[PDB]
Amino acid sequence: SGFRKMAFPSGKVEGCMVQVTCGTTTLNGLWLDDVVYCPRHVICTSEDMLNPNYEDLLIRKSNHNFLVQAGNVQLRVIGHSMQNCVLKLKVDTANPKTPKYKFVRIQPGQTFSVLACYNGSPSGVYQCAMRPNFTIKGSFLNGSCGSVGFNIDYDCVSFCYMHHMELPTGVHAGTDLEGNFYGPFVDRQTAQAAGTDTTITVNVLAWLYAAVINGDRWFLNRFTTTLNDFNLVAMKYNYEPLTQDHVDILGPLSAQTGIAVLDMCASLKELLQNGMNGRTILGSALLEDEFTPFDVVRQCSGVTFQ
Amino acid sequence: SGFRKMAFPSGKVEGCMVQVTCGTTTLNGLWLDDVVYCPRHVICTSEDMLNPNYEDLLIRKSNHNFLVQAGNVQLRVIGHSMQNCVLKLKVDTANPKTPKYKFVRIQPGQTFSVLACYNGSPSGVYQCAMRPNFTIKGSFLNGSCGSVGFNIDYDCVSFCYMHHMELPTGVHAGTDLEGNFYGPFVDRQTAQAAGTDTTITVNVLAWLYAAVINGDRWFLNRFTTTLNDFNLVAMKYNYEPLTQDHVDILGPLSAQTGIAVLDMCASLKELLQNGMNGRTILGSALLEDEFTPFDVVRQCSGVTFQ
Numbered sequence: 001s002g003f004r005k006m007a008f009p010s011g012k013v014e015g016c017m018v019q020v021t022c023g024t025t026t027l028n029g030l031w032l033d034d035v036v037y038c039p040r041h042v043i044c045t046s047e048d049m050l051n052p053n054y055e056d057l058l059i060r061k062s063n064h065n066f067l068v069q070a071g072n073v074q075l076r077v078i079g080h081s082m083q084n085c086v087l088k089l090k091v092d093t094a095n096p097k098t099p100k101y102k103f104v105r106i107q108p109g110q111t112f113s114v115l116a117c118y119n120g121s122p123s124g125v126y127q128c129a130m131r132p133n134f135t136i137k138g139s140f141l142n143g144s145c146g147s148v149g150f151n152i153d154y155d156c157v158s159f160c161y162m163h164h165m166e167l168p169t170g171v172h173a174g175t176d177l178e179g180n181f182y183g184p185f186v187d188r189q190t191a192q193a194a195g196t197d198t199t200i201t202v203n204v205l206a207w208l209y210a211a212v213i214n215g216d217r218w219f220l221n222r223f224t225t226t227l228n229d230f231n232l233v234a235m236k237y238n239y240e241p242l243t244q245d246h247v248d249i250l251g252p253l254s255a256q257t258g259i260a261v262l263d264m265c266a267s268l269k270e271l272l273q274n275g276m277n278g279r280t281i282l283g284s285a286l287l288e289d290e291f292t293p294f295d296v297v298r299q300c301s302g303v304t305f306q
Numbered sequence: 307s308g309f310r311k312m313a314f315p316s317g318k319v320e321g322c323m324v325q326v327t328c329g330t331t332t333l334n335g336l337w338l339d340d341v342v343y344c345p346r347h348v349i350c351t352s353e354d355m356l357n358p359n360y361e362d363l364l365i366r367k368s369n370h371n372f373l374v375q376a377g378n379v380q381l382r383v384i385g386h387s388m389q390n391c392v393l394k395l396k397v398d399t400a401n402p403k404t405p406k407y408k409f410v411r412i413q414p415g416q417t418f419s420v421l422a423c424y425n426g427s428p429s430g431v432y433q434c435a436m437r438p439n440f441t442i443k444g445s446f447l448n449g450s451c452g453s454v455g456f457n458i459d460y461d462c463v464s465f466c467y468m469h470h471m472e473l474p475t476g477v478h479a480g481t482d483l484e485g486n487f488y489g490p491f492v493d494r495q496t497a498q499a500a501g502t503d504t505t506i507t508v509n510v511l512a513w514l515y516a517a518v519i520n521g522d523r524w525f526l527n528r529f530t531t532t533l534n535d536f537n538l539v540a541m542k543y544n545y546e547p548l549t550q551d552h553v554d555i556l557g558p559l560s561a562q563t564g565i566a567v568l569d570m571c572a573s574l575k576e577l578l579q580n581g582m583n584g585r586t587i588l589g590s591a592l593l594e595d596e597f598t599p600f601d602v603v604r605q606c607s608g609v610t611f612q
């Protein structure tokens with residue numbers, strides 16, 4: 001019993017974190033086999049930030065311009081390449097602590113775990129969602145760039161995020177591990193805003209199922225509703241539409257609790273309409289949307305990793 | 307910017323987790339040097355749970371009754387000992403992934419990180435506080451016993467918690483790593499309840515400082531109040547008294563924000579009196595108390611580990 005924003009154990013990822021230094025700019029890199037991934041804006045200078053041309057910036061670099069620490073050990077870069085917005089620095093040493101790993105590009109709504117790092121040294125680990133506006137409500141200070149987000153699946157680290165920038169609204173923007181930004185953001189210091197965010201409806205539903213699994217049951221009703229009619233209420237309250245594919249993902253949870261999916265939809269409808277009346281679901285006074293149906297099942301059933 | 311329930315990276319602790327099996331009972335153990343710590347109720351049987359006498363239960367065991375997996379590798383117990391409520395199983399192999407480590411017994415109010423484990427395999431990592439009633443609002447399923455809680459301080463893992471049991475109210479009880487329960491709980495399957503909990507006042511204050519550091523500032527006032535008068539309002543709302551020693555710990559934060567400690571006390575007083583008016587502090591619709599002043603400074607300043 002109990003329900004926490006639970007992050008994957010971060011050991012597999014801690015042993016891949018390294019410092020990368022070009023000129024006056026120090027940020028984090030990720031070390032897999034004999035390659036170090038980091039945000040390409042490490043090659044920028046204080047005056048190269050307004051509209052940087054990374055292609056000319058990078059033709060002008062030689063390998064020894066890249067200082068890479070793995071701890072107190074000094075790695076040697078033997079070649080560099082740019083893939084979208086990430087630097088791939090081929091180094092002479094293969095990381096022996098490389099886990100089995102994949103690069104995945106995740107859909108808005110999925111969650112991942114973030115290992116926040118500074119100078120190649122992990123600081124902390126927390127759980128994030130990729131918001132519908134392809135930003136993340138993260139916790140990131142100066143020098144946090146290059147920290148990654150990831151999921152673990154038995155033994156494989158699916159890296160899904162690298163951190164690049166903080167937006168004026170305080171949310172965060174970055175890329176998959178092939179350097180494509182999530183969302184329409186660019187690695188330029190120009191005006192960019194986050195864009196209207198919505199609530200991840202299917203996750204709110206999965207969290208309400210977690211509640212039923214953990215003993216809260218006050219928010220239910222004998223009402224039901226159609227999918228069409230549910231979406232009409234959702235969009236008013238700035239929720240994402242719920243698809244039939246969402247309903248199907250929420251199947252196992254529906255069946256474990258005996259609450260039909262369109263029934264939990266009627267519960268949420270009433271919750272959005274009437275509020276929580278100053279009660280709390282799972283110790284939360286807000287409808288929580290950063291838990292996927294996978295997450296709920298991982299936590300309320302007890303899935304491990306090797 | 308941003309503020310998350312941030313757990314310490316758990317790599318150092320993942321490499322200490324092991325499975326421990328006596329008879330029909332499998333639970334987690336912690337492996338430091340050549341010793342495996344686990345809850346002593348692993349030697350219990352289904353009928354030995356009402357008022358177990360662990361001394362007679364343990365004189366009757368021989369070493370080979372203890373099956374210890376470190377992964378797919380099978381450890382050999384060469385001796386056993388009971389220290390309070392924990393088994394110390396001396397094994398023939400020293401754990402090579404033993405970090406520098408301390409056992410500390412923490413005061414209510416401190417927080418730690420929990421690595422939830424099943425069959426010796428870590429499942430997830432989240433951040434807990436030791437509540438004033440010496441329970442923890444954790445997330446724990448069957449077989450989670452032996453999972454530890456811990457803090458990291460540069461390179462040293464200060465283990466502070468082992469998990470033993472879930473209480474009827476769904477909160478969790480366990481011990482320090484020398485086997486003394488936090489609180490008045492015993493490892494017996496008899497009636498025990500959690501006891502009235504209070505809110506960790508100094509932490510609520512430190513979180514409000516985190517808010518000021520991260521841009522929220524709506525909850526302040528030109529009011530001030532005396533310590534005496536603040537405690538009078540606190541105890542009404544079931545908050546802990548705030549001591550002068552609390553005020554001093556909150557010094558660095560006071561000085562980083564220029565909000566006198568007794569001024570943030572006047573802010574909280576008004577917040578407890580008038581509510582939040584359906585606003586949110588740091589994305590939270592509740593006064594959050596599971597962040598120590600240390601935590602806020604770690605996260606809003608960026609402290610790392612090696």
Ligand SMILES: *C(=N)[C@H](C[C@@H]1CCNC1=O)NC(=O)[C@H](CC1CCCCC1)NC(=O)[C@@H](NC(=O)C(F)(F)F)[C@@H](C)OC(C)(C)C
Binds near residue numbers: 168
């Ligand atoms: C990298 N380590 C760092 C991480 C930032 C710093 C504080 N919190 C973070 O998440 N990233 C940057 O500082 C980054 C610099 C880089 C320069 C070349 C172009 C690509 C980005 N920039 C930012 O995060 C800034 N934001 C923007 O410029 C944006 F366009 F609005 F996104 C950031 C410094 O600006 C404020 C002050 C946070 C609004």
Ligand SMILES: *C(=N)[C@H](C[C@@H]1CCNC1=O)NC(=O)[C@H](CC1CCCCC1)NC(=O)[C@@H](NC(=O)C(F)(F)F)[C@@H](C)OC(C)(C)C
Binds near residue numbers: 449472494
């Ligand atoms: C150990 N792996 C396990 C972890 C529990 C199971 C589910 N969530 C957890 O945190 N611990 C126990 O099941 C433990 C068994 C042990 C037996 C000998 C005496 C010491 C404890 N017992 C409990 O957590 C039970 N609680 C109690 O008996 C208590 F006295 F109220 F604390 C638990 C199984 O009881 C309910 C059903 C959770 C109320």
